[PDB]
Design a protein around this ligand. Structure first.
Ligand code: ZN
Ligand code: ZN
Ligand code: ZN
Ligand code: ZN
Ligand code: ZN
Length: 72
């Protein structure tokens, strides 16, 4: 699954849709290789944990969309 031919110079966009405990939202985009952009997206979620609580992710669109929810 999620078949991927890697290239160091590949350029993709990972879209992170965030939903917070009070229902508020925001979307953040990360660009670079599929691997690096994905790592950056999760790193951003981690930076938001102190104020927003632990997060849960549901991967969509073959990995190009990360739906992340914060517990509060
Ligand atoms: Zn190739
Ligand atoms: Zn192939
Ligand atoms: Zn790759
Ligand atoms: Zn690489
Ligand atoms: Zn704070």
């Amino acid at each position: 699954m999620h078949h991927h031919h890697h290239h160091a110079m590949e350029e993709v966009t990972i879209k992170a849709n965030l939903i917070f405990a009070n229902g508020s939202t925001q979307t953040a985009e990360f660009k670079g290789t599929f691997e690096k952009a994905t790592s950056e997206a999760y790193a951003y979620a981690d930076t938001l944990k102190k104020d927003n609580g632990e997060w849960t992710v549901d991967v969509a669109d073959g990995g190009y969309t990360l739906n992340i929810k914060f517990a509060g």
